[PDB]
Enzyme design. Structure first.
Site, mmCIF file in Angstrom:
data_model
loop_
_atom_site.group_PDB
_atom_site.id
_atom_site.type_symbol
_atom_site.label_atom_id
_atom_site.label_comp_id
_atom_site.label_asym_id
_atom_site.label_seq_id
_atom_site.Cartn_x
_atom_site.Cartn_y
_atom_site.Cartn_z
ATOM 1 N N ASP C 54 19.531 56.384 -89.929
ATOM 2 C CA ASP C 54 20.480 55.610 -89.853
ATOM 3 C C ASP C 54 21.425 55.856 -90.532
ATOM 4 O O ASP C 54 21.095 56.681 -91.984
ATOM 5 C CB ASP C 54 19.786 54.386 -90.949
ATOM 6 C CG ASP C 54 21.589 53.487 -90.417
ATOM 7 O OD1 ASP C 54 21.506 53.276 -88.808
ATOM 8 O OD2 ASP C 54 21.748 53.259 -91.483
ATOM 9 N N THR C 87 27.543 54.451 -87.203
ATOM 10 C CA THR C 87 27.812 54.906 -88.483
ATOM 11 C C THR C 87 27.802 56.884 -87.366
ATOM 12 O O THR C 87 29.135 57.887 -87.948
ATOM 13 C CB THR C 87 26.641 54.752 -89.493
ATOM 14 O OG1 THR C 87 27.358 54.318 -89.634
ATOM 15 C CG2 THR C 87 27.929 56.077 -90.399
ATOM 16 N N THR C 88 26.925 57.547 -87.002
ATOM 17 C CA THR C 88 26.416 57.935 -86.560
ATOM 18 C C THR C 88 27.171 59.172 -85.511
ATOM 19 O O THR C 88 27.791 60.436 -85.096
ATOM 20 C CB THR C 88 24.783 58.597 -86.663
ATOM 21 O OG1 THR C 88 24.615 57.865 -85.516
ATOM 22 C CG2 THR C 88 24.012 58.502 -87.329
ATOM 23 N N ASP C 393 17.982 46.701 -87.423
ATOM 24 C CA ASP C 393 19.260 47.489 -86.408
ATOM 25 C C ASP C 393 19.100 47.000 -85.005
ATOM 26 O O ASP C 393 19.940 47.128 -84.528
ATOM 27 C CB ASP C 393 18.503 48.815 -86.231
ATOM 28 C CG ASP C 393 18.559 49.404 -88.140
ATOM 29 O OD1 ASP C 393 19.478 48.761 -88.087
ATOM 30 O OD2 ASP C 393 18.290 50.676 -87.506
#
Lengths: 517, 521, 528
Positions: C54, C87-88, C393
């Site tokens: 994550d 985020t990625t 998630d």
């Protein structure tokens, strides 16, 4: 300066070397110590007078401080192997280093995706475990005496347990719950039914997969030539919490019209159910009367509230699948059973299935006088079944002395025959590490490994699958004649641990150094 | 052709350890024999020692090299099992390491090298036993002569005639028949200044290390008494907190006196309940042993007290006497007490040694405690060590009977048999049998070098006469040449040559097992 | 002050350094992007050990001196509360905008023009993505249940959950719906409690409709279950903001004991107060007493005789979630208790979990509450933390699916459709902004090329292939293959991404890319 406080990230070029060459250097410590003829290592401290010499692989790896952050991963893998069995830690680290040694060639001069390399091992290790099963032997011979030895061991496990009231009846139930499986001995193939209003000695064994709940209201109690479908969906009042919604309508009748439109959407899923040609449907959730009434005209009985474990155990006995969605009609794995009969035991309706397709399993129904007799019996029964299953999985061995390592290579080379484009070298690299296990065992023996391993491969390739390496005479002889065997559970533990260790390490494009504690 | 790759280079680690260990064996090689060269070691504290003992030099050398430290453990087992030849086993170990250097140059894996030394060591023992002179423990003529000639190298010479049967009669009692190895720690030599060498007493029961109470009231002798070990201490009241004696009044002198005598009487009364007339208290420097007020109480009870018993004798007295160590007064019972016929203090000049006879215990077996007396302190010291060598040689005859004439005879006899046997072998091992016999010739070669005689000349004359005689050909330092070692009264037990080959074969085996050196903290 | 060791940047310098600083951190997370990425070993300074890919966890643990990459942490901290799983996606997309911004700087375009260039290009891509977007609730209701289960399965496929995912898929759907309203569509992460302990397995994890409190019911002789007591109203529990003890005045605080007389009296007075405080619980009808402070030994003696279990050391924040879920009130004093102010739940019982010695309590409710506690079990501590964040998630993905019923097809098909639409409209928009619109379409192509490299496919060949399938054949969504399948067209696989989730990613990526261009100077003081 990223990270900090002793935490750092290795360069993508150095991380691949730290995960491969750095892991081999750790495996090189246990490399020459593998086998009874292996060498020894020295562990020296700052005082230099406290040192010691030992060949133990678990002692050398844990004592030496490892500054390589990738080396700490092998320490965790060694702890997983030590939990299974206290022997074989050295063979796992060495085999994992051989897989990473060829992995350097699987990247530089290969250009193969690292996850496909792992998937290449998953297909190669599956053929490796299948090759060990075909060549597996056992000391279980004289099973007629072995089948009798199991009922006496089961009686010893009933000591101190409330089941000691009758030893003959309960030990027969535990013995027949194992040998009659002819397969995996895991508890997932044995269903436990705890009921009240009876005596412990009145319990019986039934292979018909008894489950508590019933199906249907006006539906019949018998089903002949049943077609079982397994799916999970909510056909009654989805969005379990409707509080807070706002429905904009001119009248209350229009609010129910949207519910009727939802019932029209039910026929879209019901139509896909009827295309499978099934008289029986399995659902974890409930079903409203209107979509259930349409199942009556189509002749579909719906068993509801099967939870999940009850669904998975139903898919194993009938040969089904747990998929909850419909990808396309007439494509799926379906189960079936000859007769579905509804019985009553303990003043509660039960379901007794009959004639499951290729069904191998049993259901032990425990009838107690209270909850204390039911709970303490199920915990003590699994302990008795674990001891009986321990003698089935252990004492079952395979041909050792380089045999099993080379036999797996032939099956992996068979897997390397029919394969896609990019995994051809990945599967072949797995067979190379399998041949390096008897190679290193011949290294510490003081003989020529390149001569013995090469002749061993050509010997088993054409006929003579039982041959192996003889370290005493330095030649190739039949392992069945010499009586050299090694445990099958040890072989499965090393192959499984090597696949789990390679799963984490091959995906590494960078290494995050652990924080010191 | 196609052979193993050998990607790693373990040989650089092994060859560095063999050369470093060979320099240690070559340093000890000069110390072999009575005429060998003495080695000097200067400790970091500034102390300088001089001696030819191989076990003493290797202990004080402070070797940092790990493999060379194993020679200390091999020499320790050499003195523990055989008792002699600690220098010869280091030379034989270095001789096999020197021969292994040529084996590694031929491309031979150390596993075959290690397995060949173990196979050659087992066959070398059978060669000696077939050529050995068979002797038995029933014959006391060879047991006295073997111990008498071993003491000719020690200060005691003319008095060794009476010292030999004392060591023989002590072993014949503890040897039994099939007991094989018997621990020499059961034989306790108590040395004390005074007396002479000619005065010795066997005292099969036991002997203590200390005197008796020298204060007023000490009985110093008791007849028909019981003995027990007591770890407790007879003292006035001494709580764990800070105590002090403060008397500000005339009446408090009698109050504290009677209070201390009352607590000492309760301890003396519990001892009388078990009828224990001989008390052994463990030596402790914290507090005293028995208060002077309690000495008068035990004097009326006729209870002998022997204090200052060393911690080393606590384990020994619990064995020979068959008693048990008792921590506190509550643990003190009669079942843990032994029954002694007579416990008395023997009066001697500057000695006053206490002895015990008639342990009267079935569980206890014939332990041995021998008293050593002499005028000079250097006498009773070397006399204790000289009797140790006399007990080891006799004990070697107990484990494996038979004796082999020394002077290089057993080393040559094995090499002559393995020379013809090497032709009967096949493969890589056949070359090792010739190298193994070549390393055996290092021991007789060093014996000729340290004696000033020509190295090759003496060795050739022994092998030349080896075609006529068999075990009677060897090196004689007294004759300074080649003559019969059996007629010179030079005798060696078979276990020394057996242990020297066995330990050296296992040593070099474990040396080649280490292919790497890593730092682990 | 602090003149020495002071770093100063200018326009002709920092503009090139700000791009290189972003490319360093971007290339680190490109390897962990996607289900085929890398799981990294991370150890928090508090002692928690876990392994996850994550980006919100990885980037939060990154401590570095580059001021441009610190803005990536500031945006991820605000995005972690909104989504947390993007985020990625945003950082790589923001770095792709910065890589195209550096090219426009070399062409003579001011950085403030690039900020307005990507702003108008982002708003144009939203309208084009909405036209090709599809809706769930207005299409099929039964697939809405299947979409919520298989969307969590995508996030649970890279974890050990994949075996038991069937149970956790339903637990993630119910946990989000309980804390929200269908019309309001507001989900707070503080309303869903994520907890877990060692022992058991993941198949034994239960979904709780109420608080946990980690209590053993104080004295063991107290009953482990609380009955409704013959058809009462719910199960009444007492909430006290004052500790259990004899009350003392604030003026003195001193107690003088003259002799045994006053000693025996004061000992009985303290016991009399214990009897007066327990009667207020009996008069109100509260089964269990919940207090913020511990209880004495005599306290458990009187509570055991009346069959009134006790609860000790409850935090101030936990007291708020109890009154909300059980429909209770906060009672400041002891005598102010009453049946209307007591929290009413469905039942209270102590359920032993495996061999764990904790033996916590479970307070559930039949009606929908505002507080849900998700409890996870596992054989190892690392397995519990792995399944906990994997379930969290899934809670974030379902959160955006119920927030907007319209969803877009993911797997790389979303970025290609947004790129082909802006690139076609870039030629129609003339002026200097034409290159800003073309560079925005080329920046959107970085996402499918990054996923193609991690999947073992040609990033240029696959991207050019997908553009031909969506143009010459027909307009649809066909993305790169992240997980193993037989062929293309993830639309056939029913792989969907939330429209509000994907729109939130492109807005934060543009908002940060503009802010980075709005900083041309970096002032870093030394250490005195």
């Amino acid at each position: 300066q990223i990270f900090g406080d002793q935490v750092t990230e290795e360069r993508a070029e150095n991380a691949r070397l730290s995960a491969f060459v750095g892991a081999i250097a750790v495996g090189d410590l246990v490399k020459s110590t593998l086998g009874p003829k292996g060498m020894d290592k020295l562990l020296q401290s700052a005082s230099s007078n406290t040192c010691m010499v030992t060949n133990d692989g678990a002692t050398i790896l844990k004592s030496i401080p490892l500054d390589n952050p990738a080396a700490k991963v092998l320490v965790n893998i060694s702890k997983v192997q030590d939990d299974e069995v206290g022997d074989g830690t050295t063979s796992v680290t060495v085999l994992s280093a051989e897989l990473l040694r060829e992995a350097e060639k699987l990247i530089d001069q290969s250009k193969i995706h690292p996850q496909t390399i792992i998937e290449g091992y998953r297909l190669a290790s599956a053929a490796a475990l299948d090759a060990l099963t075909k060549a597996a032997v056992d000391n279980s011979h004289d099973k007629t005496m072995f089948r009798e030895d199991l009922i006496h061991i089961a009686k010893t496990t009933l000591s101190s347990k409330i089941l000691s009231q009758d030893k003959d009846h309960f030990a027969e139930l535990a013995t027949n719950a194992i040998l009659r499986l002819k397969g995996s001995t895991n508890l997932e193939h044995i269903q436990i039914i705890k009921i009240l209003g009876g005596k412990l000695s009145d319990s019986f064994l039934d292979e018909g997969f008894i489950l508590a709940k019933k199906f249907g209201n006006n539906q019949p109690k018998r089903i002949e030539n049943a077609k079982i479908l397994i799916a999970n969906t909510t056909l009654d009042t989805d969005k379990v919490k409707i509080f807070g919604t706002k429905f904009k309508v001119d009248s209350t009748a229009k609010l129910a019209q949207l519910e009727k439109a939802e019932r029209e959407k039910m026929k879209n899923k019901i139509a896909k159910i009827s295309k499978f040609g099934i008289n029986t449907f399995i659902n974890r959730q409930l079903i409203y009367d209107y979509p259930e009434q349409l199942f009556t005209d189509l002749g579909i009985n719906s068993i509801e509230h099967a939870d999940f474990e009850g669904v998975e155990r139903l898919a194993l006995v009938t040969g089904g699948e747990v998929v909850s969605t419909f990808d396309e009609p007439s494509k799926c794995k379906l189960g079936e059973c000859d007769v579905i009969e509804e019985i009553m035991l303990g003043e509660q309706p039960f379901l007794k299935f009959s004639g499951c397709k290729a069904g191998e399993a049993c259901t032990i129904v425990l009838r107690g006088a209270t909850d204390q007799t039911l709970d303490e019996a199920e915990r003590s029964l699994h302990d008795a079944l674990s001891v009986l299953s321990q003698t089935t999985k252990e004492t079952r061995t395979v041909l050792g002395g380089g045999c099993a390592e080379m036999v797996m290579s032939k099956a992996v080379d068979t897997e390397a025959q029919n394969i896609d484009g990019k995994k051809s070298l990945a599967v072949e690299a797995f067979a190379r590490a399998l041949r390096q296990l008897p190679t290193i065992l011949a290294d510490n023996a003081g003989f020529d490994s390149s001569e013995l391993v090469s002749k061993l491969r050509s010997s088993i390739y054409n006929g003579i699958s039982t041959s192996g390496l003889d370290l005493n005479n330095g030649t190739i002889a039949d392992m069945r004649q010499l009586g050299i065997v090694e445990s099958y559970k040890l072989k499965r533990a090393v192959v499984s641990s090597a696949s789990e260790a390679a799963e984490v390490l091959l995906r590494v494009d960078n290494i995050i150094r652990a924080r010191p504690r | 052709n196609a052979t193993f790759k050998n990607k790693e280079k373990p040989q650089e680690v092994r060859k560095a350890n063999i050369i470093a260990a060979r320099s240690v064996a070559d340093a000890i090689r000069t110390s072999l024999g009575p005429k060998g060269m003495d080695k000097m070691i200067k400790t970091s504290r500034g102390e300088i020692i001089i001696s030819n003992d191989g076990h003493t030099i290797l202990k004080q050398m402070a070797i940092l090299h790990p493999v060379a430290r194993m020679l200390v453990e091999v020499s320790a087992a050499q003195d523990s099992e055989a008792g002699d030849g600690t220098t010869s086993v280091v030379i034989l170990t270095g001789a096999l390491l020197g021969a292994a250097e040529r084996l590694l140059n031929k491309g031979i894996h150390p596993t075959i090298i290690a397995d060949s030394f173990q196979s050659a060591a087992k066959r070398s023992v059978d060669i000696l036993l077939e050529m050995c002179h068979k002797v038995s423990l029933s014959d006391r003529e060879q047991l006295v002569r073997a111990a008498s000639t071993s003491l000719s190298s020690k200060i005691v010479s003319q008095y060794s005639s009476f010292l030999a049967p004392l060591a023989v009669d002590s072993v014949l009692k503890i040897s039994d028949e099939n007991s094989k190895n018997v621990d020499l720690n059961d034989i306790r030599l108590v040395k004390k200044v005074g007396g002479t060498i000619d005065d010795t007493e066997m005292i099969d029961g036991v002997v203590l290390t200390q005197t008796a109470i020298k204060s007023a009231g000490g009985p110093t002798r008791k007849e028909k008494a019981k003995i027990g070990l007591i770890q407790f201490q007879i003292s006035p009241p001494k709580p764990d907190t800070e105590n002090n004696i403060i008397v500000n009044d005339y009446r408090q002198m009698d109050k504290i006196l009677k209070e201390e005598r009352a607590y000492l009487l309760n301890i003396c009364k519990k001892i009388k309940k078990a009828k224990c007339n001989v008390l052994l208290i463990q030596k402790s420097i914290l507090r005293d042993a028995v208060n002077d007020l309690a000495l008068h109480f035990l004097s009326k009870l006729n209870i002998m007290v022997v204090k200052d018993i060393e911690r080393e004798e606590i384990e020994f007295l619990s064995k020979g006497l068959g008693c048990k160590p008792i921590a506190d007064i509550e643990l003190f019972t009669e079942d843990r007490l032994g029954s002694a016929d007579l416990v008395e203090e023997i009066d001697s000049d500057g000695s006053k040694i206490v002895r015990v006879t008639g342990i009267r215990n079935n569980n206890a077996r014939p332990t041995v405690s021998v008293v050593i007396r002499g005028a000079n302190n250097m006498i009773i010291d070397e006399t204790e060590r000289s009797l140790h060598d006399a007990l080891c040689v006799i004990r070697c005859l107990v484990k494996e009977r038979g004796l082999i004439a020394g002077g290089g005879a057993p080393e040559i006899e094995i090499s002559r048999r393995l020379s013809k046997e090497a032709r009967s072998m096949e493969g890589v091992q056949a070359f090792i049998w010739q190298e193994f016999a070549s390393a055996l010739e290092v021991i007789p070669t060093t014996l000729a070098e340290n004696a000033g005689l020509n190295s090759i000349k003496v060795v050739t004359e022994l092998r030349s006469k080896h075609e006529n005689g068999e075990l009677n050909d060897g090196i004689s330092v007294r004759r300074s040449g080649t003559t019969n070692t059996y007629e010179e009264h030079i005798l060696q037990p078979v276990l020394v040559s057996t242990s020297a080959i066995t330990l050296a074969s296992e040593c070099v085996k474990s040396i080649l097992r280490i292919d790497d050196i890593a730092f682990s903290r | 002050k602090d003149q020495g060791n002071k770093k100063r940047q200018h326009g002709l310098e920092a503009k090139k350094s700000h791009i290189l600083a972003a490319r360093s951190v971007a290339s680190i997370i490109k390897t962990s992007l996607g289900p085929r990425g890398l799981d990294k070993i991370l150890i928090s300074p508090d002692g928690e050990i876990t392994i996850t890919n994550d980006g919100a966890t990885i980037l939060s643990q990154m401590e570095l001196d580059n001021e441009i990459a610190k803005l990536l942490v500031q945006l991820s901290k605000s995005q972690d509360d909104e989504i947390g799983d993007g985020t990625t996606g945003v950082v790589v997309l923001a770095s792709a905008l910065l890589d195209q911004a550096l090219e426009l700087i070399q062409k003579g375009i001011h950085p403030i023009k690039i900020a307005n260039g990507f702003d108008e290009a982002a708003k144009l891509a939203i309208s084009k993505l909405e036209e090709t977007c599809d809706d769930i609730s207005a299409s099929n209701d039964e697939l809405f249940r299947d979409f919520l289960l298989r969307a969590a399965k995508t996030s649970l496929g890279s974890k050990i959950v994949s075996k038991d995912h069937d149970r956790f898929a339903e637990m993630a759907v119910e946990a989000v719906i309980n804390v929200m309203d269908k019309d309001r569509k507001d989900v707070d992460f503080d309303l869903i409690k994520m907890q877990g302990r060692v022992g058991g397995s993941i198949s034994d994890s239960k979904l709780i409709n109420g608080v946990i409190l980690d209590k053993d019911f104080s004295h063991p002789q107290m009953p482990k279950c609380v009955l409704p007591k013959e058809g009462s109203d719910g199960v009444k529990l007492a909430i006290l903001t004052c500790p259990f003890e004899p009350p003392k005045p604030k003026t003195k605080h001193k107690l003088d004991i003259s002799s045994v007389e006053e000693y025996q009296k004061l000992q009985t007075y303290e016991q009399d107060k214990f009897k007066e405080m327990i009667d207020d619980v009996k008069k109100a009808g509260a089964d269990v007493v919940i207090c913020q402070w511990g209880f004495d030994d005599e306290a458990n003696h009187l509570l055991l005789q009346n069959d009134l279990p006790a609860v000790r050391w409850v935090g101030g924040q936990e007291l708020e979630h109890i009154a909300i879920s059980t429909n209770g009130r906060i009672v400041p004093r002891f005598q102010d208790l009453s049946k209307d102010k007591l929290g009413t739940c469905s039942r209270i019982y102590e359920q032993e979990f495996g061999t764990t010695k904790d033996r916590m309590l479970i307070i559930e409710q039949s009606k929908e509450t505002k507080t849900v506690t998700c409890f996870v079990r596992g054989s190892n501590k690392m397995i519990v933390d792995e399944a906990e964040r994997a379930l969290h998630d899934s809670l974030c993905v379902v959160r955006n699916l119920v927030k907007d019923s319209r969803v877009v097809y993911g797997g790389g098909a979303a970025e290609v459709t947004m790129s082909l639409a802006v690139s076609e409209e870039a030629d129609k928009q003339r002026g200097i902004d034409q290159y800003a619109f073309r560079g925005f379409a080329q920046a959107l192509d970085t996402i499918p090329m990054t996923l193609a490299e991690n999947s073992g496919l040609d990033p240029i060949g696959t991207l050019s292939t997908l553009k031909s399938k969506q143009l010459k054949e027909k307009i649809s969504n066909i993305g790169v293959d992240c997980l193993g399948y037989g062929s293309n067209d993830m639309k056939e696989l029913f792989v969907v991404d939330p429209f509000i989730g994907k729109k939130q990613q492109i807005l934060l990526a543009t908002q940060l890319c503009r802010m980075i261009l709005k900083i041309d100077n970096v002032i870093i003081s030394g250490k005195d």
